[PDB]
Amino acid sequence: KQVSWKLVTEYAMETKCDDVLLLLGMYLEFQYSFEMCLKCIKKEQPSHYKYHEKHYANAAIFADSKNQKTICQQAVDTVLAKKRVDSLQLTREQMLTNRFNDLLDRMDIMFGSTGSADIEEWMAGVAWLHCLLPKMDSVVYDFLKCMVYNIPKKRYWLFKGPIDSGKTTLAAALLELCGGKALNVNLPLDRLNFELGVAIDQFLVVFEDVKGTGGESRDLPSGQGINNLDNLRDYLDGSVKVNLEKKHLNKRTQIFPPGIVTMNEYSVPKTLQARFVKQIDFRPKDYLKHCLERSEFLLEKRIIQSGIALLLMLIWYRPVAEFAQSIQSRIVEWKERLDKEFSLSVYQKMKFNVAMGIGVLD
Amino acid sequence: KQVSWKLVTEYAMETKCDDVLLLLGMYLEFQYSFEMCLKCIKKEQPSHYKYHEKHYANAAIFADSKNQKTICQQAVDTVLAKKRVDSLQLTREQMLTNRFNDLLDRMDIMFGSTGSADIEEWMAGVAWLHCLLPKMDSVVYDFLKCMVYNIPKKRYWLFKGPIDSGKTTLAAALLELCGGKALNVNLPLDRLNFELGVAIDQFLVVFEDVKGTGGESRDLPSGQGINNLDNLRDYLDGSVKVNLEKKHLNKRTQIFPPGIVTMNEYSVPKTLQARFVKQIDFRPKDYLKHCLERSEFLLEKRIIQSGIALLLMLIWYRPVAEFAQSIQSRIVEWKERLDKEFSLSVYQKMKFNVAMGIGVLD
Amino acid sequence: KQVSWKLVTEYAMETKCDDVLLLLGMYLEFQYSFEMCLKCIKKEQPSHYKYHEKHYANAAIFADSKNQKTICQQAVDTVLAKKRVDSLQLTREQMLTNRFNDLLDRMDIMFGSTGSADIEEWMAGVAWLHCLLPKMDSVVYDFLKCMVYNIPKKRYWLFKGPIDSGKTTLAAALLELCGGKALNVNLPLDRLNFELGVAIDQFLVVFEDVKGTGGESRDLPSGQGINNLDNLRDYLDGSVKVNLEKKHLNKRTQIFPPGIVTMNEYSVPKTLQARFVKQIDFRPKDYLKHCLERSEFLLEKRIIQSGIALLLMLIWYRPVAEFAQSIQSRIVEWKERLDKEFSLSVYQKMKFNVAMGIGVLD
Amino acid sequence: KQVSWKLVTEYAMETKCDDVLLLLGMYLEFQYSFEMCLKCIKKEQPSHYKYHEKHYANAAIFADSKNQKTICQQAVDTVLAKKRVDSLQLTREQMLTNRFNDLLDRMDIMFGSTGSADIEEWMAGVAWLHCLLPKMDSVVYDFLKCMVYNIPKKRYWLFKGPIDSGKTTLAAALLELCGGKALNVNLPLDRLNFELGVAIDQFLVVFEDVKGTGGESRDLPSGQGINNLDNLRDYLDGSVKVNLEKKHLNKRTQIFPPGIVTMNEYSVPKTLQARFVKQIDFRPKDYLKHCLERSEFLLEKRIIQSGIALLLMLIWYRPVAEFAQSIQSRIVEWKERLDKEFSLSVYQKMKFNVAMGIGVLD
Amino acid sequence: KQVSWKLVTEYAMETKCDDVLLLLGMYLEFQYSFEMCLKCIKKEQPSHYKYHEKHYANAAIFADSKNQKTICQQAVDTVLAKKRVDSLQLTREQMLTNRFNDLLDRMDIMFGSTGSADIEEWMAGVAWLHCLLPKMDSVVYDFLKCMVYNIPKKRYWLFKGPIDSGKTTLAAALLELCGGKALNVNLPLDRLNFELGVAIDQFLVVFEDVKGTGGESRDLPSGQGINNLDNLRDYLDGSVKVNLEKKHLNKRTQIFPPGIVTMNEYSVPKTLQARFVKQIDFRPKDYLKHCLERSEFLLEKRIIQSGIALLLMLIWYRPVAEFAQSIQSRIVEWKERLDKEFSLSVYQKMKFNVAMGIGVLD
DNA sequence: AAAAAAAAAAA
DNA sequence: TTTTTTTTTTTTTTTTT
Ligand SMILES: Nc1ncnc2c1ncn2[C@@H]1O[C@H](COP(=O)(O)OP(=O)(O)OP(=O)(O)O)[C@@H](O)[C@H]1O
Ligand SMILES: Nc1ncnc2c1ncn2[C@@H]1O[C@H](COP(=O)(O)OP(=O)(O)OP(=O)(O)O)[C@@H](O)[C@H]1O
Ligand SMILES: Nc1ncnc2c1ncn2[C@@H]1O[C@H](COP(=O)(O)OP(=O)(O)OP(=O)(O)O)[C@@H](O)[C@H]1O
Ligand SMILES: Nc1ncnc2c1ncn2[C@@H]1O[C@H](COP(=O)(O)OP(=O)(O)OP(=O)(O)O)[C@@H](O)[C@H]1O
Ligand SMILES: Nc1ncnc2c1ncn2[C@@H]1O[C@H](COP(=O)(O)OP(=O)(O)OP(=O)(O)O)[C@@H](O)[C@H]1O
């Protein structure tokens, strides 16, 4: 009997693999009988233990086949095809709603009885993040609206300030929340073509620690980054479609994604300053440093850097009426859950600990 | 039964798909049964609900197939072949007529009973654009006729002015109205070969935001853009054919399109400036900014950069004797529809609102 | 009868061949008869004598085949697919535990009755290394813990001091222990992209002898390294996924590996110094030099740089509970072996010899 | 039945088509019944209406085939192969016989169709150039034959005069007649090699504005051009093959092209002056400068520079024996158009008005 | 019958062809009949006359085939696969042992009845070389041992002396004996990386004529070479692995080869002087110069540059037991042959003739 | 030289 | 047509700066 290419494509769709080697590796695990399969018995990874019993019969035939990489290539192109259809046909609010659904699915596993996480650690993260900026939850909500409306020349935000002020921490959390890529523009202009091509079909991009000039009077080293962004200011505008490039592929014509620029305090030419809607000045705070020294699990487990921490901040602080109607059902259920496992008394205690520089937990 | 490759080519020719991945994604949607299709009963996108009933029988067989990307590649090449036949065999006025017939079909769907658009916002769009330049509708009509004549050495218009002047918004509207591509020529000369290859078979080219050198006392950072256009001199003149390149596909020899060049107030070489037939100078106007702040629905729905807004300007201001003969009858239909919806007193009120800097629609 | 592609994939998986030409070369050795096989009689290389009996039948058929490279290519992709699945799905503890199992398998070959090595010469290396830094085994243990936890911005160590001070000796030993690669960031900036591409899917990276400007009055050469390294701030941090490239391959998005910087006495920017957790000052001290003049065998056999010397140092000095539970069984068998053919009275005499500056062995 | 690839190859050779997508598109037009065919009945394009009836049967079978691009690329290779067989065996007079047919096909755009500027002001262009130099039309034919014979040492012509001498206009006109390219030799010696390498595989060259040594006493800006060109004697004389370099490519060996040198009244060194066959002085004429002030369309429709006007001069004045046997019929077929449209008196009026310093009248 | 791919793979392995076109050319010569074959009768090339008789039948069928390049590709792959297995698994002693009996095969052909080499002239070369340095055969034997043992920091030699002293003569002879390649480190430091990439998988490298910077007052040109070697400390020392780069190929990691540095009477920094295990001083000698004038055949046949002359020197002067056991029997046969053709009185007469310049063979 | 996809052989 | 099998060519990288 022959291999069903359909069953492989169906597995790739359910798991969202866009890598041929990953898909080949995963599917070849299903050769062995599930009756004795140690990974299924341990329940270590969901993309194995859910699917092995369904795919065992087909994977045994697949391991005898001669054209295995061709089968996987067709499946990966099917996933990339759906991804491109969805980029052209969905509204940006639906794309964000789909992303929140994915995060909530991961939260159900992570805080379920098979999961590792304790919510007290994650909500201690919410408390630490809310101390970072005045009205943090309003800032996060204002950012989400800005990325959904995608208004020409009113698209990009600037994070500015000295070393260890939290720019990258908040930027990385917002990048996971929305889904997107970080780009390095400090490289010289010639190979910048293939860097920018990483942005194809992405929802956000972040430009990380762009270097300027003249900062040597403050002991900041010079570089090409700000000069390079001046050359790309039609990509920042978003009024008109730009041409984006991958090695050995022809150019994709699309409007470039919105997002965040992170900077140390170099001077910004007025031509770029005209592209930025809002500047957030980060400043370092002594009590936040003292707190992370006592509560190091926040850095080991990457809690303050996670999008799930910012999603929990939104679930806690925002009215239900600010979410899309499809997910309001799931978010009322998650508010009910958080209302059991916390009280305002525990959360206010956590905030008071952080302002004193004490450990978050007690 | 076997797959019909002809049916896939019919779907692709009816939909005008240039992308193999997009065509694959859309045709795979048809594998699910028509009797229950949620997108057919909600009528989300016409490229689905018009065609799914016809194609369900064939898409079931296509989903089992091993050749899927090869089938789509031949369908995409059939559509690209038609574009090359039409580009060489049609007159430029017939091409512009075909562009307007597609824009008007889009307007019929957009302002129909199924439509979402509100025409008062779009005619406020016309009013805002008419304030941007004196005798705007004559500037638009001169451009359209200039691009249809395409006389060698008199093919390019220069848009010049400071950091916020409206030059990009007007170029973007003309680009949708005429069709074309925007190109970035601030990058080094080496990789421009594949950038210029995007101009193959197009009607217009827009060279956006060409950086100059000197004028630095204005606080404009310098760059290679103007030096690159001092090269490429024969592409602008168009008195000769050029070779255009794209990856793996064989190169094509054609006369390069006409276009628009936008730049901030850099000093321009005389050898370049000799090749532009017209300069339009753009000035900041304080009242236009106050107007958009109070009427931001114009930016959210991208009305002031849409080609449809310039076509509605042309329908309103120009006589039917200035349009082509085949399109007369539907322009007569639209021009009566517009006089039925708007009293001239409403348009006069709108234009007075914009000059007064109050919100339009107030 | 026809060639089994399954047996070739099995041999490649057992041997871990990810080079197509090496696999082809190895497998074509099996076409000759097992009985007369001089390599099975001498027992030189284990990759031959363990497997020839099993694969003889299939290798004879493979030698008559017309598509030998197509067969080998699939096997090499199967091995790379396992490697990419393991990178995405294993914990860093498991990765390190697997690496220790591989080194212990090597040690069983080196010190078994077919092997060439003498345990007392390797153990002299441990004594010389334990004299290089104070509390050396705590330093090696702290490093492994740091590389496993991979805490953001707290994950690089700096080795700093004069020339001939032991930096690259120790760094090379740590590199073989953890597995990873050494990078030269002193290159010109446009070569630097492919130099950073060496790090893809590695556990550890080491930056060898980075040079700066200034300090030239100390007779230090000048160089670009520190300037380049300060463009790469976000690669060191590990907060976001960087985009890594190889020649002719599309960009891989992943978190950059942690590791070590080795440096002469330049000054360093605060932007970089904020990214190092620990600075270890290496000082030259002449008893170690006079020792190595007299105990030359340490240099000649490469014992002093090898990771197996550090692993032996961890087995001699650390409690058994500090190793992962799967490997504790082998480590107590090795502690028994070392206590049986080596003694504490010998070890303190070896260390006394090194401190006295005299040849280590009796 | 099955597709005849030979019939497709015959169509490609009869239409002389060397684009694979263009061939695919035009051949797919033949799949419809010729009894009904609107493009035939409208007689729009010869590449359709002649061939449809013959190719209809094959085109219907071709539309069902799965390998359509394979069929078309064999046919395009057949046309490219014929072109290379001819080109490698081409005499230099057959090269010019080909070059002027392309310019004639461009003039057949103003023949019998409104798609062009009015010829009456282009004959004023013929007249105005015939007033620039004594016996202008004989200068053109002597120059043409000089370039066709390629006689060593007898190959370069020198044009001298101040600003506003017309030398650049006639240099442009002669260049655009013949299809060479223009080179700049004012560069420092380090850069000349890539400038000279532009001349590869090319019919003519022009050297523009070679700035001399000294000349400030005539208010002429000094440069290296004359001094450089004196060093290029082996390129100018044309007896031996020079090696020429394009950027990134390997060298080619050929005999360097003939053509034109243009100068202000700098001093020409005797060693360089001996290499020019003929010096033509251009001198400013006040009556021409008044005429062109009174007849702006000469410059603003680019009549005087466009080298097509020099063929339009050769058309009328010159005998029939002065043209090759394969185009003698085609010129007299063209020439009777002007014999019907014009008279000696109106051309004498054109000349007279120019000589009087007024625009053409009556 | 049908082509045996196995017989072609044998021929490629026996000839060691890693070039597909060379193999294709060689194998197609075998289609013509053996009985009449002029190349076999004249015995011009051993790669033909040995094998033609065996392969005639397969070559006749191969000449009719359609797959000819694919058969040759697989055969070339088989040869390259063996080279990589041998590179990764052989001891350095087996590598040199294989290189010697490869040279003994060349010696057999040269000095056989079919050959063209006069052993009296080659033995005169051995005499002239033995007079170049004191204890020459021990110098050569010590060098071989040093390169085989590859002991870190005891693995580079320095050759120093005036121009025309014999340095590249001896260095070139040692390269042919061991195998290896020459390197030019006088390039600027940013062009050096592809030059160092020549060393990949080589047994030796020679640094040819490194120039110093000071000492110009002795008429010695200034250059970068020794300053570049000071920077490459870690490549020479050989304790740790380095990354090496070929054009278009990914970086490979290995311990850089041992070798020779050759220089004029430049000043050496003391840091570099400590990296050489030995320094050999070459001084011009008049009697060798006057001998070479009378014994010109040494230069004209390139005898004194060749590795075969050094191998004849080791065969003549060294005891049998210090060659590897596989080659001892072949060297005993060669010792018998040489003692048959030469007595000690003839050889000491040749040394006596050199020492006073009368001319070796008199 | 490797990757994307084409192009062909035998039942 | 189906399955198994064989083949092409270019871009990128280098070169250039
Ligand atoms: N506002 C803050 N005040 C004090 N310490 C902070 C603050 N934000 C972050 N930290 C600490 O500093 C570490 C680094 O933070 P982060 O990298 O986000 O800063 P950054 O301002 O973006 O830095 P850089 O300019 O180096 O990119 C965090 O892991 C945390 O321990
Ligand atoms: N004439 C104008 N006066 C004042 N504000 C203007 C004017 N035209 C446009 N604006 C404002 O400037 C914004 C940007 O307009 P636009 O993109 O056309 O500017 P531009 O001059 O082309 O810019 P750039 O020089 O950056 O390419 C608009 O969205 C609007 O808010
Ligand atoms: N602490 C030390 N004191 C004295 N000699 C030392 C010391 N450590 C190493 N050595 C000697 O110095 C030699 C070189 O050591 P090593 O390569 O580790 O130096 P390094 O300073 O780290 O080098 P680099 O900066 O060039 O990588 C060793 O082989 C040993 O002989
Ligand atoms: N004989 C003439 N007398 C006066 N004016 C002339 C004459 N011929 C041409 N002109 C006008 O003078 C202009 C400048 O001359 P032209 O274009 O030939 O450049 P040029 O004389 O080579 O000068 P430059 O060295 O400045 O480029 C022409 O374009 C035309 O308008
Ligand atoms: N010791 C010597 N004394 C005199 N003449 C010599 C001696 N060795 C070589 N010769 C002659 O000098 C020529 C040049 O020798 P060789 O190529 O070795 O020169 P080198 O100056 O030492 O090398 P390099 O140019 O690489 O530094 C030889 O071909 C030979 O004719």
Residue E6: which of C44, C45, C64 has the nearest Cβ? C64
Touching subunits for chain C (3+ Cβ pairs under 8 A):
A, E
How many whole angstroms separate alpha carbon E288 and alpha carbon E336?
30
What are the backbone dihedrals phi and psi of residue B279, each rounded to the nearest 5 degrees, phi first?
-110, 135
How many whole angstroms separate alpha carbon D131 and alpha carbon D136?
8
What does each C-alpha distance from E235 to B200, C179, E154, E242 come to in angstroms?
A: 51, 21, 13, 7
How many whole angstroms separate alpha carbon B142 and alpha carbon B214?
32
Technique of determination: cryo-EM
How many whole angstroms separate alpha carbon D110 and alpha carbon A250?
39
What length is written for chain C?
362
Let me know: does A171 contact A211? Beta carbons within 8 Å.
Answer: no
CA of A191 to C1' of G16 (A): 14
Which residues of chain B does A242 touch, with a Cβ-Cβ cutoff of 8 Å?
A: 182, 184
CA atoms within 13 A on the CB side of E185: 26
Q: What is the full DSSP assignment across C196-245? A: HGGGTT-SEEEEEEE--SS-GGGTPPP-SHHHHHHHTHHHHH-SS-EEEE
SS3 C262: strand
The packing angle between helices B328-341 and B307-317, to 10°, is 90
> Nearest 5°: CA angle at A199, between A194 and A203?
175
Residues of C (70-109) placing their beta carbon closer than 7 angstroms to any atom of strand G are: 70
What lies within 8 Å, CB to CB, of D322 at 6+ separation is D141
CA atoms within 13 A on the CB side of E277: 19
Q: What is the 3-state secondary structure (H, E, C) of chain E?
A: CCCCHHHHHHHHHHHCCCCHHHHHHHHHHHHCCHHHCHHHHHCCCHHHHCCHHHHHHHHHHHHCCCCHHHHHHHHHHHHHHHHHHHHHHCCHHHHHHHHHHHHHHHHHHHHCCCCCCCHHHHHHHHHHHHCCCCCHHHHHHHHHHHHHHCCCCCCEEEEECCCCCCHHHHHHHHHHHHCEEEECCCCCCCCHHHHHHHHCCCCEEEECCCCCCCCHHHCCCCCCHHHHHHHCHHHHHCCCCEEECCCCCCCEEECCCCEEEEECCCCCCHHHHCCCCEEEECCCCHHHHHHHHHCCHHHHCCCCCCHHHHHHHHHHHCCHHHCCHHHHHHHHHHHHHHHHHCCHHHHHHHHHHHCCCCCCCC
Q: Which nucleotide is nearest to A20 (CA to C1')?
A: F3
Q: Which residues pair with B279 in a beta bridge?
A: B158
Q: Which residue is nearest to nucleotide G13 (CA to C1')?
A: E248
Instruction: Tell me whether residue C180 is exposed, middle or buried, using C-beta atoms within 10 angstroms of its C-beta: 0 to 12, 13 to 18, 19 or more.
Output: buried
Nucleic strand F under 7 Å from the C-beta of E248: yes
Nucleic strand F under 7 Å from the C-beta of D73: yes
What does each C-alpha distance from A225 to A191, A235, A267, A272, C217 come to in angstroms?
A: 13, 15, 12, 12, 32
Let me know: does E126 contact E118? Beta carbons within 8 Å.
Answer: no
Ligand with the closest atom to the CA of E128: 5
List strand residue ranges (DSSP E) for D123-193, in order: 156-160, 181-183
Distance A170 CA to ligand 1 centre (A): 9
Give, using CA atoms, the residue closest to atom 2 of ligand 4. Answer: D284
What are the backbone dihedrals phi and psi of residue C280, each rounded to the nearest 5 degrees, phi first?
-105, 115
DSSP state letter for D31: G
How many whole angstroms separate alpha carbon A23 and alpha carbon C121?
47
Give, using CA atoms, the residue closest to atom 3 of ligand 3. Answer: C284
Min distance E151 CA to chain C CA atoms (Å): 5
Q: Which nucleotide is nearest to B3 (CA to C1')?
A: G1
Q: Do C248 and A247 touch (CB under 8 A)?
A: yes
Resolution (in Å) of the shown entry? 3.1
Nucleic strand F under 7 Å from the C-beta of C66: no
Helix (H) or strand (E) holding D53: helix D52-63
How many whole angstroms separate alpha carbon A304 and alpha carbon A126?
7
DSSP state letter for C282: -
Let me know: does B25 contact A81? Beta carbons within 8 Å.
Answer: yes
CA atoms within 13 A on the CB side of D213: 7
Q: What is the full DSSP assignment across A61-72? A: HHHH-S-HHHHH
Q: What is the CA radius of gyration of chain B?
A: 23
How many whole angstroms separate alpha carbon B124 and alpha carbon B299?
12
What length is written for chain B?
362
Let me know: does A233 contact A288? Beta carbons within 8 Å.
Answer: no
What lies within 8 Å, CB to CB, of C316 at 6+ separation is C123, C126, C338, C347
What lies within 8 Å, CB to CB, of E281 at 6+ separation is E160, E161
What lies within 8 Å, CB to CB, of D305 at 6+ separation is D169, D172, D173, D176
How many whole angstroms separate alpha carbon D73 and alpha carbon D18?
9
Choose the residue to mutate in B158, B169, B211, B281 for probing ligand 2, maximizing ligand atoms within 8 Å of C-beta: B169
Instruction: Tell me whether residue A72 is exposed, middle or buried, using C-beta atoms within 10 angstroms of its C-beta: 0 to 12, 13 to 18, 19 or more.
Output: buried
Distance E290 CA to ligand 5 centre (A): 13
- How close are the terminal C-alpha atoms of chain C, in Å? 63
Q: Do B221 and A89 touch (CB under 8 A)?
A: no
Min distance D294 CA to chain B CA atoms (Å): 20
Which residues does ligand 4 sit against, CB inside 6 Å? D 132, 163-169, 209, 284-285, 288-289, 292, 299
Question: Do B and A have ≥3 inter-chain CB pairs under 8 A?
Answer: yes
* Strand F bases with any atom < 7 A from protein Cβ: 1-9
Q: Which of E190, E275, E196 is nearest to E224 (CA)?
A: E190
Q: Do D24 and B250 touch (CB under 8 A)?
A: no
Which residues of chain A does B305 touch, with a Cβ-Cβ cutoff of 8 Å?
A: 152, 239
Q: Do D45 and B153 touch (CB under 8 A)?
A: no
Touching subunits for chain E (3+ Cβ pairs under 8 A):
C
CA of E314 to C1' of F9 (A): 58
Distance A344 CA to ligand 1 centre (A): 28
How many whole angstroms separate alpha carbon E3 and alpha carbon E228?
55
Give, using CA atoms, the residue closest to atom 24 of ligand 4. Answer: D163
Instruction: Tell me whether residue A12 is exposed, middle or buried, using C-beta atoms within 10 angstroms of its C-beta: 0 to 12, 13 to 18, 19 or more.
Output: buried
How many whole angstroms separate alpha carbon A325 and alpha carbon A93?
11
Nearest ligand 4 atom to the CA of D292 is 31
> Residue D331's CB: how many other CB atoms inside 10 A?
20
DSSP state letter for B193: H
Let me know: does E233 contact C167? Beta carbons within 8 Å.
Answer: no
How many whole angstroms separate alpha carbon A230 and alpha carbon B298?
27
SS3 B257: coil
SS3 D284: coil
Let me know: does A78 contact A12? Beta carbons within 8 Å.
Answer: yes
